[PDB]
Amino acid sequence: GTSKLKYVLQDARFFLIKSNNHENVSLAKAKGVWSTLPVNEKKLNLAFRSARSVILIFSVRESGKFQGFARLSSESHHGGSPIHWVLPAGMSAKMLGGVFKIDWICRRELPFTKSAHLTNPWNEHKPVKIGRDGQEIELECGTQLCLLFPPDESIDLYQVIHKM
Numbered sequence: 578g579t580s581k582l583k584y585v586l587q588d589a590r591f592f593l594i595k596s597n598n599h600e601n602v603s604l605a606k607a608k609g610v611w612s613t614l615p616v617n618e619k620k621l622n623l624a625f626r627s628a629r630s631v632i633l634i635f636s637v638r639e640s641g642k643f644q645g646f647a648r649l650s651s652e653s654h655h656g657g658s659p660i661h662w663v664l665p666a667g668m669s670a671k672m673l674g675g676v677f678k679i680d681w682i683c684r685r686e687l688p689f690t691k692s693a694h695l696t697n698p699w700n701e702h703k704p705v706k707i708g709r710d711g712q713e714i715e716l717e718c719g720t721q722l723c724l725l726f727p728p729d730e731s732i733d734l735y736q737v738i739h740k741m
């Protein structure tokens with residue numbers, strides 16, 4: 578069912594995350610972490626304290642898809658287990674902000690072609706697939722985008738609901 582999902586998304590905030598490559602999404606999926614640039618880190622920290630759920634929706638650039646979405650489970654922190662992000666040549670690990678712990682809500686992909694009817698009011702109502710890294714997606718668009726993903730039957734949102 579979608580009911581616990583809808584509960585987790587109730588009054589969530591949603592942020593488009595752009596990964597340069599699949600390796601970093603796969604590391605995020607395996608490690609339950611994400612790191613972003615300071616400008617997005619501060620937005621996500623602000624959002625994490627402001628909303629019951631902060632949902633990161635991941636898209637690998639040039640993939641034409643979203644690769645799933647995750648709920649922030651912490652603010653960003655530094656010093657932890659280092660993550661060997663395959664970073665775009667031009668960026669160093671120091672350029673990144675701290676590390677967010679995330680709980681994956683959906684590890685399945687969704688092709689952009691399936692979200693072509695969703696516009697993001699916070700990006701001039703451009704298709705929700707369109708957005709810079711860190712782009713916040715308004716609640717209704719964000720919720721409908723997440724409900725478009727194939728259900729991820731490997732995930733039990735029971736523990737996620739407990740965190741919120």
Ligand SMILES: CC1=NC(=O)CC=C1
Nearest residue numbers: 597601612613614662
């Ligand atoms: C982990 C990562 N985050 C980004 O915001 C860009 C590239 C790699």
